[PDB]
Symmetry: D3
Subunit: 125 residues, 6 copies
């Protein structure tokens, strides 16, 4: 149950621990409209040759009236993480770090939403 | 028809900060939550009738502590990494803007706080376990 | 004359605010209605404490709008003014980093207040007196 | 007496972060901006036609050096202080909530940054020049 | 040379890289004014029994009025760090992380000051009050 | 107990109350590796001519693998301030302001640590 890596590009961050999982995106050659759109979360034990897919995440690619609805938005994933962290706060695992994180995520959503509202005033959205 | 599954015990995720214009986010109902949180999420098209959900994407989080149960789903940090990567690509484009910069900053701080939790919980040797 | 009696007006003192030339007064807590002060006066500082030299009057919306109508400004309007002026300052020879940080903080203040408002829109209780 | 006055050269402050559901904010014409900023704001009612403004309140800021023109207006700090006092009153009430707490923190930090600049000018001795 | 650890405790925090230096203070029982006031930074060669000093950092204990200047403030060290990071930003190693740190440290200073300014609204100074 | 100020420069910030102490450092012309490394905290009693020193603070100057361990790192000082501020919070002096300051200092640590980790992913440490 593996699949070849190929030119799938591994997303390494300084803030990755990459202890359990690794994140990949499509080859930078295939980025449409300035950004990657097709991510894979796989298991880290894997050799660089292959990826052990745990999950596939595909973002909205292309204009909506033209290619339909074919993926998720950033806001959706952030909302998922916020929901889970709020659940964790309602448990014995409540802690100040999760609270800080939730605040940071809500402020993130605020700033992206500010981008859309500003365009709306000009009608561009 | 072939793209519809019933809402059933799935709950819509309401948030006032999310536009909900083209998509809706669902999760499993609270009764079914294990390890205190939802783990099985669906993003689906908004203009659907309530009785059904039209799935676009399935996202399944790690259910259970890994040391005990192994690896069976994504982590919060993985999704946040995807979002940071996309926002930084946007910044490296003609559509660089200040709002995207702010969002990147907030997301990186979010990762740093979650990471402080993980660091502290490494030092205690209780990382990936179910202990408080 | 230009002076009015202080009377039951109360001085708003805050360490973070300089207070060299202006003073902020509000109606007394006793006469506060709707859980907050609503009738503020900026006056000149070097005036008799017994009196107030009014520079400006600012009256806020008293009571939810859907129940009492419209009778004053909201917090959001004042903050919008301050943001507009600081941005004008940024688009001038006096552009600086402190003004940029202040604009950011005020915009985040608006976004937090706005999240409250949107959550009450979802709950259908916006502009009411419900919790 | 219709409680209603012509817009004219007044300009409308449209911002993405403001809904304009109940009130609209106007300022004086950009051509009449003195010393790089607007100084004469109006809060009016939104349902009015663009032709006119239904004034609720007028807010004026210090325009010009005090030595020469006097104290003619308010400071940004004054309005921020009013808003903080009001939100802290709300927190001491059944309407206590976390968003208000955030707002207070943000507004206090805003005051801190504005105060920073002055303190800096003071240390360098170039204040109010 | 070397001094033994004895009644000195290592300040471990997960946010600190710990890679070449260690930080020590008086052991908890000796704290005065509810706080550690005598810190030593030292080498990480692990003679668990002993500490290899690099710097002694001593904080003001007590009311200045009662005891006089006898140590350093938190403000002073934070000033040193801000000054170095601003120097770094005026260098080939300018970076966004350093800019963030300078902002966080300036806001730290701003909050501590509020505490004092608010105390000065009541006039209480350098006191147990 | 005095020392001449001489080349030393006073570091003055508005955000400093600084009513009782002043902080001095070496001359900019003697700054090495782009930044100051030698600092003194002194009483403000004195005139410009002299410094009365309460404390000496010397930071690690030169790469650690050439010159050994000859000074402190910013992380150490920030650590100490955090540790004392948490101490005050377990005391009658607990205030919101302090908590907020501890939050800011911890976020400072997170950002500086983000630099090292990034450099580490890129494989570089303490390079020129
Ligand atoms: Zn912040």
């Amino acid at each position: 149950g593996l699949v070849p890596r190929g030119s799938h590009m591994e997303i390494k961050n300084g803030l990755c621990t990459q202890k359990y999982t690794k994140v990949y995106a499509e080859d930078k050659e295939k980025w449409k409209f300035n950004a990657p759109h097709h991510f894979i979360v796989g298991k880290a034990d894997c050799e660089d040759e292959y990826i052990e897919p745990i999950e596939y995440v595909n973002f909205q690619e292309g204009p909506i009236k033209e290619y339909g609805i074919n993926g998720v938005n950033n806001e959706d994933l952030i909302l998922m993480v916020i929901t889970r962290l709020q659940a964790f706060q309602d448990s014995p695992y409540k802690c100040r770090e999760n609270a800080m994180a939730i605040t940071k995520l809500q402020e993130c959503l605020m700033w992206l939403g500010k981008r859309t509202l500003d365009r709306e005033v000009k009608g561009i959205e």
